[PDB]
Amino acid sequence: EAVVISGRKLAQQIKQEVRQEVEEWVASGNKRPHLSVILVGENPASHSYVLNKTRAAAVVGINSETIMKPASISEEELLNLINKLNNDDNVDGLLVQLPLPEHIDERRICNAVSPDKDVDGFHVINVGRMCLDQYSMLPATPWGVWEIIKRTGIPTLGKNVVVAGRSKNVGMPIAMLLHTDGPGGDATVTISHRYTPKEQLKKHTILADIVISAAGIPNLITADMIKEGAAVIDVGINRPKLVGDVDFEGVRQKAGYITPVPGGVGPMTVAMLMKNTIIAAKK
Amino acid sequence: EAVVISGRKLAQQIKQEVRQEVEEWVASGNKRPHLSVILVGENPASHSYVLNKTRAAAVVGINSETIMKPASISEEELLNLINKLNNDDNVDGLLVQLPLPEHIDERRICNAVSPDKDVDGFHVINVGRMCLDQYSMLPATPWGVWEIIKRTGIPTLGKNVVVAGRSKNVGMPIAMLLHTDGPGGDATVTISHRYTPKEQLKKHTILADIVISAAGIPNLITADMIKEGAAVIDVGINRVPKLVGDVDFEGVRQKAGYITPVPGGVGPMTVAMLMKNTIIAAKK
Ligand SMILES: Cn1c(Nc2ccc(C(=O)N[C@@H](CCC(=O)O)C(=O)O)cc2)nc2c1c(=O)n(Cc1ccc(Cl)c(Cl)c1)c(=O)n2C
Ligand SMILES: Cn1c(Nc2ccc(C(=O)N[C@@H](CCC(=O)O)C(=O)O)cc2)nc2c1c(=O)n(Cc1ccc(Cl)c(Cl)c1)c(=O)n2C
Ligand SMILES: Nc1ncnc(O)c1NC(=O)Nc1ccc(C(=O)N[C@@H](CCC(=O)O)C(=O)O)cc1
Ligand SMILES: Nc1ncnc(O)c1NC(=O)Nc1ccc(C(=O)N[C@@H](CCC(=O)O)C(=O)O)cc1
């Protein structure tokens, strides 16, 4: 049977590592780190995720605030808030929770966060730095997927990795990290587009040593699609319950490793954000 | 038998479009576009490629200069020259021909070119904009591969593309463009890694509607790796004393539905797209 990797448990010990790094940095005489999160509107998924982020910040000794604004705010008002937080020497990390209302250009907002405070890694120069391996801050979800693979010990060097992506923003950063010269992953990588039918994806998945599903489609990954003992990482978030992309009971019979949803990649995203925030506070 | 796509012929159409775009722009009273190329040292392939670029510039109405420096140039003098050209208002496009001598850090050099003049798209800002679909300019070779596919009319949406890259810088931007939502192909893309087993790659190429080989090993792509009707695009450059691509051209010519030759395929398309990037930069 597949060994189940507890993302929650691994995230909790990464948080314990961050806490002691934070307490060391403060005992050494430095300002306690502070994370500011901007939340716009009433998306229930966004509010839940931001709650998990600020809870984790408390666990690791990082001060935090969630600044909640109504969905009717204008782009210029959001830019003014970001400029204020950019110039506030108490703020080490700044991220805007996405998605934003349609009258706000998401790309302009992310590029307005100071690159040094951009703990999500969404600023265009931080994206460029990540592609060129010139970075210091990785986006939290791809870095969390990498930490799962690395801390478990799943081999990548010369293996076949398949990533099924809902969008380029989701699958490509994951594949970027996994394809890169050794982070780094030194693996052959497929990034499947959502317009590729399930039957064609299957011919890619059956060859994969590592399957990473980020498609937001329930039951997209079933046991017939996986060679025996492959690692299956479920990033899908699907909604009166919450399910991933993987047929968990099904492929548990065939995979060598599997991550559950909830309790898998989700907690690792939050834990890697705390890593980025102590990184930002020390720069 | 495969259709043989003529890179020279498509590049000619693209260069005709740039010339018309340039003459109209000049007709309206604007400055003629100018491209500056910095060429360091005596790499014979680099000189040949830069000459192709400046010849294409002249025939489309774009002014050009190649600034040749010896390989023993220091990194500081190269940076000083780049800073001079960044501030020269006559210069719309600036590119540094790579590779540079070992004592020079090329990432520092590429990031020293003004992003507004970076017609190669190698500056870290422009790498990011390409990833985020914020760009004005695209790397010439990835954009050339895309135009070959798009202008020939080879379907990409939901199709299987394999890119066999010699490094991340080569394979990733090509894969990026083809994976992007429709440039952009909406395609599933495999990026095989350097030194990947030929039989391991075979398992992915067999499924591919489009095989893009950019690995620089002769005869990487033989017929037993292709499904019938597939499009094969040869980006390889190899000396064996003559230039050949990565594809066994005569062998794959039977199997494939489309094939590009080397020379005469991607090569001229790379040069032509740089001409597009240069008028884009001059237009700001
Ligand atoms: C701008 N952005 C975005 N936006 C975005 C995110 C979520 C939602 C949403 O609705 N999210 C859903 C689900 C969220 C989830 O997936 O958990 C919700 O919560 O309601 C809508 C928009 N997600 C990005 C980037 C970005 O910039 N980067 C840098 C990057 C780095 C390397 C490369 Cl190669 C590339 Cl391409 C991009 C990224 O890594 N991610 C991942
Ligand atoms: C820094 N660089 C380099 N260097 C480089 C190029 C050629 C040679 C050489 O010796 N070339 C030989 C072999 C032939 C050939 O290369 O044509 C020669 O010319 O004689 C040596 C070094 N090539 C890059 C980038 C880069 O920055 N970008 C942006 C980019 C955009 C999106 C993404 Cl995702 C990424 Cl990762 C990167 C790129 O697209 N290419 C393609
Ligand atoms: N949208 C964004 N804008 C800006 N920066 C970002 O990083 C994002 N993306 C996220 O914030 N993604 C995210 C997804 C799930 C969790 C999470 O905590 N999942 C739990 C609980 C499940 C649930 O509450 O439904 C689990 O899986 O166990 C946390 C973050
Ligand atoms: N190194 C770089 N540094 C900075 N920016 C770049 O873009 C590059 N890369 C190139 O400039 N790549 C390139 C390769 C071949 C041709 C070409 O014209 N090929 C001919 C044969 C030519 C011959 O061998 O004489 C053909 O195939 O028909 C043109 C450009």
From Swiss-Prot, chain A:
PTM-bearing positions, type N6-acetyllysine: 15
The cofactors it requires, by name, are:
Mg(2+)
- Residues bound to substrate: 49-53, 96-98, 262-266
User: According to the UniProt record, what happens if one changes residue 133 to S?
Assistant: 82% decrease in NAD-dependent dehydrogenase specific activity. 65% decrease in NADP-dependent dehydrogenase specific activity. Reduced affinity for magnesium
What are the UniProt keywords, alphabetically? Acetylation, Hydrolase, Isopeptide bond, Magnesium, Mitochondrion, Multifunctional enzyme, NAD, NADP, One-carbon metabolism, Oxidoreductase, Transit peptide, Ubl conjugation
Question: What are the BP-aspect GO terms?
Answer: folic acid metabolic process; formate biosynthetic process; tetrahydrofolate interconversion; tetrahydrofolate metabolic process
Keyword Oxidoreductase attributed: yes
Q: Name one GO cellular component term.
A: mitochondrial matrix
Q: Where do we see the Glycyl lysine isopeptide (Lys-Gly) (interchain with G-Cter in SUMO2) cross-link in this protein?
A: 15
Q: Does the keyword DNA repair apply?
A: no
Annotated GO MF terms = magnesium ion binding; methenyltetrahydrofolate cyclohydrolase activity; methylenetetrahydrofolate dehydrogenase (NAD+) activity; methylenetetrahydrofolate dehydrogenase (NADP+) activity; phosphate ion binding
Q: What is its EC number?
A: 1.5.1.15, 3.5.4.9
Consequence when changing residue 133 to E: Complete loss of NAD and NADP-dependent dehydrogenase specific activity
Q: Which family does it belong to?
A: Belongs to the tetrahydrofolate dehydrogenase/cyclohydrolase family.
- Further facts: This NAD-dependent bifunctional enzyme has very different kinetic properties than the larger NADP-dependent trifunctional enzyme and is unique in that it requires formation of an enzyme-magnesium complex to allow binding of NAD.
Instruction: Name it.
Output: Bifunctional methylenetetrahydrofolate dehydrogenase/cyclohydrolase, mitochondrial
UniProtKB/Swiss-Prot annotation, chain B:
Instruction: Give the sites modified to N6-acetyllysine.
Output: 15
Principal subcellular localization: mitochondrion
Query: What does the entry list as the binding residues for substrate?
Result: 49-53, 96-98, 263-267
Q: What is the effect of changing residue 133 to A?
A: Significant loss of NAD and NADP-dependent dehydrogenase specific activity
- Give the enzyme's EC designation: 1.5.1.15, 3.5.4.9
- Annotated GO MF terms: magnesium ion binding; methenyltetrahydrofolate cyclohydrolase activity; methylenetetrahydrofolate dehydrogenase (NAD+) activity; methylenetetrahydrofolate dehydrogenase (NADP+) activity; phosphate ion binding
Swapping residue 133 to E leads to an effect described as: Complete loss of NAD and NADP-dependent dehydrogenase specific activity
Record's subcellular location: Mitochondrion
Q: Name one GO cellular component term.
A: mitochondrion
Identify the cofactor(s).
Mg(2+)
An example GO biological process term is:
tetrahydrofolate metabolic process
Question: Has UniProt tagged this entry with the keyword Methyltransferase?
Answer: no
Q: Which UniProt keywords apply?
A: Acetylation, Hydrolase, Isopeptide bond, Magnesium, Mitochondrion, Multifunctional enzyme, NAD, NADP, One-carbon metabolism, Oxidoreductase, Transit peptide, Ubl conjugation
**Covalent crosslink: Glycyl lysine isopeptide (Lys-Gly) (interchain with G-Cter in SUMO2):** 15
Q: Does the keyword Coiled coil apply?
A: no
User: Catalytic activity annotated for this protein?
Assistant: (6R)-5,10-methylene-5,6,7,8-tetrahydrofolate + NAD(+) = (6R)-5,10-methenyltetrahydrofolate + NADH; (6R)-5,10-methenyltetrahydrofolate + H2O = (6R)-10-formyltetrahydrofolate + H(+)
How changing residue 194 to A affects the protein?
A: Significant loss of NAD and NADP-dependent dehydrogenase specific activity
Q: Where does NAD(+) bind?
A: 165-167, 194
State the family named in the UniProt similarity comment for this chain.
Belongs to the tetrahydrofolate dehydrogenase/cyclohydrolase family.
Per the entry, what this protein does is: Although its dehydrogenase activity is NAD-specific, it can also utilize NADP at a reduced efficiency.
Q: What else is known?
A: This NAD-dependent bifunctional enzyme has very different kinetic properties than the larger NADP-dependent trifunctional enzyme and is unique in that it requires formation of an enzyme-magnesium complex to allow binding of NAD.
Subunit structure and binding partners:
Homodimer.
Q: What is this protein called?
A: Bifunctional methylenetetrahydrofolate dehydrogenase/cyclohydrolase, mitochondrial
Q: Which organism is it from?
A: Homo sapiens
Gene behind this protein: MTHFD2
